Amino acid sequence: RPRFSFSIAAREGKARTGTIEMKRGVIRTPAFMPVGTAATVKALKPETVRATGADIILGNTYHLMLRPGAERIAKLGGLHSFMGWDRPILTDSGGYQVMSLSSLTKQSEEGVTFKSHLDGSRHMLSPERSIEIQHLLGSDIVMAFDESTPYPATPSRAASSMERSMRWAKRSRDAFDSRKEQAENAALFGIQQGSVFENLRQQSADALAEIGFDGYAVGGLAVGEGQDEMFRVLDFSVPMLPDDKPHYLMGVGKPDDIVGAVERGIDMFDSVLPTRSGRNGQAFTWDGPINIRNARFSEDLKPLDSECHCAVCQKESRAYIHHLIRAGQILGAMLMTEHNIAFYQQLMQKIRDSISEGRFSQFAQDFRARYFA
């Protein structure tokens, strides 16, 4: 296989379906990428994650740089060998989780220094160090290091952070290219910033296209703005990105947000929602989410979802899973998580099939009517 080849097989309005071919495997798009390094609640073997239909998983640079450490992972043969997943891995840059999880931070044009939320040890990230860490992990899709823009943001702060992010995108590009092994075997995605401002989104897209990336993420969304606003921003933002490269919506999200984002040209998604939901008792179904802890499920012998093809729905009852989750059993979290991740993959498959067949608009309508009935 090639290092990277994105091919669009079919289109419907702004929606696209196709494939990304990489050395470690093919990724079907639109794609959902489950998190493979979720704190505390990692509950599935790699074979199980693959069985749900996932083509690629996401690794968190921030968590991995703290435990077990990036240099250690490299010594042990890289992240694929370490965790036992041989297909593509996308790594985030670490920047977002520094801002959201670390205890103290000092930000500058060079990068950020921070204290671990685990033991208060001191660490550093910069465009160069982030790219280096993602190299040590051996990830297949590397994210450029950017500076987060909180929500809401003033026009001035949105502009400043977008501008810094574009300077950092060039630094990321150069760091990636200067490492032969990484440049020849991995891909690099840039991240569009600009908050809710169309002019800043345009400047960011133009800067990123001038530098040139293998894919383009829409950053700065799913940070509390609400679906209406997120959709409004996607409406103008996605068409600014190169049409012939994948479009990645970071941190999204809920099933309806995914459907609407595909309607607006997005090809790739990640979110902790399905994995985190599991242990907390939330199961996704075609008739909307349910909370399995609710007493109404205590004697319900039906599967979590009536149509779901997953191994959990083939074998396990709502009543048993209700009991396991109530009783604080590890197995309850395992079953909920396997189902939720599988549900998301079945959603993506239905999206892909409907675009290929020219009936995605109808699917989106039918999906919403039932999911929110």
Task: Give the interface with Cl ion as residue ranges (CB under 5 A).
Answer: 67-68, 153-154, 157, 323, 326
The stretch near a copy of itself (CB under 8 A) out of 69-77, 91-99, 147-155, 349-357 is 69-77
Task: State yes or no: is 92 an active-site residue.
Answer: yes
Number of H helices, E strands in the chain: 16, 16
Q: Which of 75, 157, 296, 302 binds a copy of itself (CB under 8 A)?
A: 75
Q: Is 69 labeled as ligand-binding? A: no
- 333 is a contact residue toward a copy of itself (CB under 8 A): yes
Q: Is 138 labeled as ligand-binding? A: no
List the catalytic residue out of 92, 214, 257, 305: 92
Beta strands in 284-325 (DSSP E): 290-291
User: Tell me, what amino acid is at 208?
Assistant: L
| Cβ proximity to a copy of itself, 16 vs 318, nearer residue | 318
Q: Is 160 labeled as ligand-binding? A: no
- 83 is a contact residue toward a copy of itself (CB under 8 A): yes
Enumerate the β-bridge partners of residue 29: 18
H/E element holding 31? strand 31-32
H/E element holding 311? helix 311-315
- 321 is a contact residue toward a copy of itself (CB under 8 A): no
Task: State yes or no: is 287 an active-site residue.
Answer: no
Whether residue 134 contacts residue 143, with contact meaning beta carbons closer than 8 Å, is answered with yes
> After which residues, if any, is the chain broken (C to N > 2.5 Å)?
none
- What, of a copy of itself, Cl ion, Zn ion, none, does residue 310 touch, CB below 5 to 8 Å by kind? Zn ion
Nearest in space to 344 (alpha carbons), one of 333, 332, 336:
336
- Residues 146 and 161: their CA atoms lie apart, in Å, by 8
Q: Which of 202, 211, 331, 349 binds a copy of itself (CB under 8 A)?
A: 331
Residue count at the site for a copy of itself (CB under 8 A)?
34
Using the 8-state DSSP alphabet, how is residue 35 labeled? B
- Residues 158 and 152: their CA atoms lie apart, in Å, by 9
List the catalytic residue out of 257, 267, 270, 305: 270
* Least distance CB 70 / a copy of itself (angstroms): 13
Whether residue 116 contacts residue 102, with contact meaning beta carbons closer than 8 Å, is answered with yes
* Least distance CB 309 / Zn ion (angstroms): 7
- Residues 39 and 324: their CA atoms lie apart, in Å, by 21
- For 32, other C-beta atoms within 10 Å of its C-beta total 26
Q: Which of 45, 117, 164, 254 binds a copy of itself (CB under 8 A)?
A: 45
Q: Which of 14, 50, 82, 291 binds a copy of itself (CB under 8 A)?
A: 82
| Cβ proximity to a copy of itself, 21 vs 300, nearer residue | 300
| Cβ proximity to Zn ion, 64 vs 347, nearer residue | 347
* Least distance CB 329 / Cl ion (angstroms): 10
Residue 30: cis peptide before it, omega within 30 degrees of 0: yes
H/E element holding 122? strand 122-125
Q: Is 93 labeled as ligand-binding? A: yes
The stretch near a copy of itself (CB under 8 A) out of 173-181, 283-291, 293-301, 302-310 is 293-301
The stretch near a copy of itself (CB under 8 A) out of 11-19, 68-76, 201-209, 226-234 is 68-76
Whether residue 32 contacts residue 54, with contact meaning beta carbons closer than 8 Å, is answered with yes
* Residues of this chain that bind Zn ion (CB under 5 A): 308, 310, 312-313, 339
- 86 is a contact residue toward a copy of itself (CB under 8 A): no
- Residues 50 and 1: their CA atoms lie apart, in Å, by 20
Q: Is 146 labeled as ligand-binding? A: yes
Q: Which of 15, 31, 44, 292 binds a copy of itself (CB under 8 A)?
A: 44
- 324 is a contact residue toward a copy of itself (CB under 8 A): yes
3-state secondary structure 50-68: HHCCCCCEEECHHHHHHCC
Q: ∠ CA(55), CA(265), CA(96), 5° rounding?
A: 65
- What, of Cl ion, a copy of itself, Zn ion, none, does residue 339 touch, CB below 5 to 8 Å by kind? Zn ion
Nearest in space to 322 (alpha carbons), one of 281, 275, 276, 277:
281
Q: Which of 151, 231, 236, 320 binds a copy of itself (CB under 8 A)?
A: 320
Please list the active-site residues: 92, 270
Q: Binding site: which residues?
A: 92-96, 146, 193, 220, 308, 310, 313, 339
